[PDB]
Amino acid sequence: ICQDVENLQKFVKEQKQVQEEISRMSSKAMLKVQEDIKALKQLLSLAANG
Amino acid sequence: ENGEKITSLHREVEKVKLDQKRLDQELDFILSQQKELEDLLSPLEELVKEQS
């Protein structure tokens, strides 16, 4: 049994690591995009009006 | 949501390039009307120093 808790907390925690891992990983790259396509669309309107 | 815009961006972009091409080669040709209609206003410099 107390082999036991040595492992389970270990597999659980191993998992929290991945949770951290995702947490480390987070977006600005994404936020960037809408701004750009919103911007490119506008230049296209230029060229078109030109 | 952004991808879609991207789409009608692609769209309407290559129809802008259908545009310009066209207007491009147009300008050649309005341009060529200007090299011909010119050589030959004269060679209309014969026909008019002859009359002279």
Extended beta strands in chain B, E state: none
| B contacts of A47 (beta carbons < 8 Å) | 16
Find out whether A49 and B18 touch, Cβ atoms under 8 Å: no
Which tokens is A23 given?
């947490």
Place of tokens 């050649």: B28
Can you give the length of chain A in residues? 50
Find out whether A40 and B8 touch, Cβ atoms under 8 Å: no
| B contacts of A33 (beta carbons < 8 Å) | 2
Residue of A nearest to B6 (CA): A37
Calpha distance A23→A18 (Å, rounded)? 8
Residue A39 touches chain B, beta carbons under 8 Å: no
Q: Which run of H or E residues covers position A43?
A: helix A29-49
Which burial class, exposed, middle or buried, applies to A33 when counting CB atoms under 10 A from its CB (0-12, 13-18, 19+)? middle
